Amino acid sequence: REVALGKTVRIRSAGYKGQLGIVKDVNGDKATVELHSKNKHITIDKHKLTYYNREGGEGITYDELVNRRGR
Amino acid sequence: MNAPDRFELFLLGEGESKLKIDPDTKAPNAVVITFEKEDHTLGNLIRAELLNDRKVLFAAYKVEHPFFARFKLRIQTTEGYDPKDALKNACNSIINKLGALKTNFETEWNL
Amino acid sequence: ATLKYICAECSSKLSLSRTDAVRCKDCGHRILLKARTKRLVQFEAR
Amino acid sequence: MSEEGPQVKIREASKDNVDFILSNVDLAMANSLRRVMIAEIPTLAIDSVEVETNTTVLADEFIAHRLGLIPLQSMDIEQLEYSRDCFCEDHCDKCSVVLTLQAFGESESTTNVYSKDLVIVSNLMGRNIGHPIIQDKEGNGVLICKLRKGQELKLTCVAKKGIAKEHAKWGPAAAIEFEYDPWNKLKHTDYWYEQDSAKEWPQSKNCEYEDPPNEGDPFDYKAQADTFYMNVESVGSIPVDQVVVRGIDTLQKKVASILLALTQMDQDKV
Amino acid sequence: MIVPVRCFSCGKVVGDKWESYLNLLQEDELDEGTALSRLGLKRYCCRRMILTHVDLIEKFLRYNPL
Amino acid sequence: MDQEKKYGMSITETFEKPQRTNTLRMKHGTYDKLDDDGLIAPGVRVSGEDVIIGKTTPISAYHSKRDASTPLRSTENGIVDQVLVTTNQDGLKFVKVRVRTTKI
Ligand SMILES: [Zn+2]
Ligand SMILES: [Zn+2]
Ligand SMILES: [Zn+2]
């Protein structure tokens, strides 16, 4: 019942800053996120990457726990 | 796809150090220095400058594999001379030469 | 579904549902194509 | 005229090429300078493309690659911070430049899309970066794609700092000519004469520039390569003189960083 | 399909030279070599980029779009 | 390619997004990218075993419908560029999708 499942996200910091992907699997503090331009899968901390809307809009941090929705 | 990231060859990763010195037991007063993220560019210059010195008895470098951007430099100096001192002297001479060359090029381009 | 079906050689933004047949209201073609997605489409130049 | 270090002598200068002679310098230093100038100068190029509508006959990856290959102004590139080292989520005004391109087909004939159509929507804060380089008499620039009537192209691009080592799109130099010892005085190469070496092998244009022809004198084993003839060509993002200056600065910075790391490790050891 | 932005070998930017090349070929009646020399392409690496280029974009544009 | 083939009279497949409530022995691939009609809109990046076409067939305990979706190939990935929907000769639904990839 993880909120970070099937949501469009953007990776901040590290070497993949600005990349766009969709979360696929969550393993504890680490989550597997695919990439749009690159055909590869990377695992990073779920608390790091930001969260966007499926259609498109503003981005927010991991504060989505208090609001079980998108955006 | 197993293709490595392009930035991995010039960016220092977490838990990695740019320099790492190991003493060499094959010959006295010999050390081995391992560099990271360098591809022949500093290696050739450093080896040439070290060979330009008179107190250095050995100076060579090699790249084990093109996949990883890292080369090992081995320096053997005369008795009573620290190889780190020779490396510092070579680096200082390189800095001085580069500064002089830049100043000369700027002066030539100004006219 | 709605606003997601472009007729061939018509470029008409006609909309379908679970009951309407697969046809165009201007020319009657039996071939339709989905217009596009509204999600973010981002590519890297590298 | 500064100390007994390397000496320079500019033969020909232009807006895209510079010809100079390097003297009183070792071969390794010249090779390192050339390598730095071809693969170490930081520049500005489009790295992320967001596509809204693409009704053209070209694929999205095609247009993204073509846009990423377009040169951009990078004169004030030292005032832009790396994206990885910037304290931001994706990109801000102090670490990236945002460009938007909109194209539509009005006339019945084909409507070309050029690099001059790119519009900067971010705030440059007075910095001279992000402007596409248009070296053309007509002023159109680099052709991106061709679309007919009805087709519409609309996308947003983000430009970020980078070096040629990561990707070839960040390289400021096109081709650098490197040559030394026009005559075989140092015997550094063996020619492939079939009947005669002199007739079969054409003479280089640098033979007349100094380097008097050799005679029947004994071979000199104490001579070393010290004179180099170099020609640097720039794509257009950075001036050639600035290209050489930045290459020298980058080499000096790398050596200084090595020295700083050595001093830090010495302090940590003690 | 369309002219490459940069030369594959060295990296010289040739994106605005296609229109000028065609104009020199069809106004001034120059041969390919003279037009290439006039455009400034000296090395054959850059010369082959536009000397042996196929403009397939027009054939795609012939089809009616949406 | 996929078809809305019909068994007998009332046993006809349908194109819709399947749900856990009434679908049994269904695939474990992601269904988020699917739409109400059961097809992925062009321009959506897909990878792995993601389901591109959602088809279910009636069984004849509940679970009256059983999935028949075709996932993407394991070693293939890319972005869908064109989705074609039409009708076959007899009058059922015909669906064709395309995936575009660049091979450097
Ligand atoms: Zn129609
Ligand atoms: Zn920033
Ligand atoms: Zn070339």
UniProtKB/Swiss-Prot annotation, chain A:
* Location in or out of the cell: Nucleus; Mitochondrion; Chromosome
The KOW domain is annotated at 3-36
Source organism, top-level taxon: Eukaryota
Coiled-coil intervals, chain numbering:
none
Q: Cite the domain annotation text.
A: The C-terminal repeats are critical for activity.
Recite the other comments: It is phosphorylated in a PKA-dependent manner in vitro. Present with 2340 molecules/cell in log phase SD medium.
Q: What does this protein do?
A: The SPT4-SPT5 complex mediates both activation and inhibition of transcription elongation, and plays a role in pre-mRNA processing. This complex seems to be important for the stability of the RNA polymerase II elongation machinery on the chromatin template but not for the inherent ability of this machinery to translocate down the gene.
As for family, the record states: Belongs to the SPT5 family.
How this chain assembles, per its entry, is: Component of the SPT4-SPT5 complex. Interacts with RNA polymerase II. Interacts with SHE2.
What is the protein name stated in its UniProt record?
Answer: Transcription elongation factor SPT5
Protein's organism: Saccharomyces cerevisiae (strain ATCC 204508 / S288c)
UniProtKB/Swiss-Prot annotation, chain B:
Secreted as a keyword of this entry, yes or no, is no
- Is Transcription one of the keywords? yes
One CC-aspect GO term = nucleus
Q: Which Pfam families does the UniProt entry name for this protein?
A: RNA_pol_L_2
Q: Name one GO molecular function term.
A: DNA binding
Q: Which domain of life is it from?
A: Eukaryota
Family, per entry: Belongs to the archaeal Rpo11/eukaryotic RPB11/RPC19 RNA polymerase subunit family.
Name the record gives this protein? DNA-directed RNA polymerase II subunit RPB11
Q: Gene symbol?
A: RPB11
UniProtKB/Swiss-Prot annotation, chain C:
Task: Specify which residues bind Zn(2+) according to the UniProt entry for this protein.
Answer: C7, C10, C24, C27
Q: What is this protein called?
A: DNA-directed RNA polymerases I, II, and III subunit RPABC4
Q: What does this protein do?
A: DNA-dependent RNA polymerases catalyze the transcription of DNA into RNA using the four ribonucleoside triphosphates as substrates. Common component of RNA polymerases I, II and III which synthesize ribosomal RNA precursors, mRNA precursors and many functional non-coding RNAs, and a small RNAs, such as 5S rRNA and tRNAs, respectively. RNA polymerases are composed of mobile elements that move relative to each other. In Pol II, the core element with the central large cleft comprises RPB3, RBP10, RPB11, RPB12 and regions of RPB1 and RPB2 forming the active center.
List the GO cellular component terms.
cytoplasm; nucleolus; nucleoplasm; nucleus; peroxisome; RNA polymerase I complex; RNA polymerase II, core complex; RNA polymerase III complex
The Gene Ontology terms for molecular function here are: DNA binding; DNA-directed RNA polymerase activity; zinc ion binding
Cell location = Nucleus, Nucleolus; Peroxisome
One GO BP annotation is: tRNA transcription by RNA polymerase III
Included range, full protein: 25 to 70 of 70
Ranges annotated as C4-type zinc finger: 7-27
Q: What is the lineage of its organism?
A: Eukaryota, Fungi, Dikarya, Ascomycota, Saccharomycotina
Share any extra remarks.
Answer: Present with 907 molecules/cell in log phase SD medium.
DNA damage found in the keyword field:
no
**This protein's UniProt keywords:** DNA-directed RNA polymerase, Metal-binding, Nucleus, Peroxisome, Ribosome biogenesis, Transcription, Zinc, Zinc-finger
Family, according to the entry, reads as follows: Belongs to the archaeal Rpo12/eukaryotic RPC10 RNA polymerase subunit family.
Keyword check for Translocase, yes or no.
no
From Swiss-Prot, chain D:
Q: Its domain of life?
A: Eukaryota
UniProt keyword Metal-binding present:
yes
Q: Which UniProt keywords apply?
A: Acetylation, DNA-directed RNA polymerase, Metal-binding, Nucleus, Transcription, Zinc
GO terms in the biological process aspect are:
RNA-templated transcription; termination of RNA polymerase II transcription; transcription by RNA polymerase II; transcription elongation by RNA polymerase II; transcription initiation at RNA polymerase II promoter
- As stated in the Swiss-Prot or TrEMBL entry, residues carrying the post-translational modification N-acetylserine are S2
A GO term from the CC aspect: nucleus
Report the subcellular localization.
Answer: Nucleus
Specify the effect of K9E. Answer: Transcript termination readthrough
Molecular function (GO) terms for this protein are:
DNA binding; DNA-directed RNA polymerase activity; metal ion binding; protein dimerization activity
Q: Where does Zn(2+) bind?
A: C86, C88, C92, C95
User: What does the UniProt record say this protein does?
Assistant: DNA-dependent RNA polymerase catalyzes the transcription of DNA into RNA using the four ribonucleoside triphosphates as substrates. Component of RNA polymerase II which synthesizes mRNA precursors and many functional non-coding RNAs. Pol II is the central component of the basal RNA polymerase II transcription machinery. It is composed of mobile elements that move relative to each other. RPB3 is part of the core element with the central large cleft and the clamp element that moves to open and close the cleft. Seems to be involved in transcription termination.
Q: What else is known?
A: Present with 10000 molecules/cell in log phase SD medium.
User: What's this protein's family per the entry?
Assistant: Belongs to the archaeal Rpo3/eukaryotic RPB3 RNA polymerase subunit family.
Name this protein carries in UniProt: DNA-directed RNA polymerase II subunit RPB3
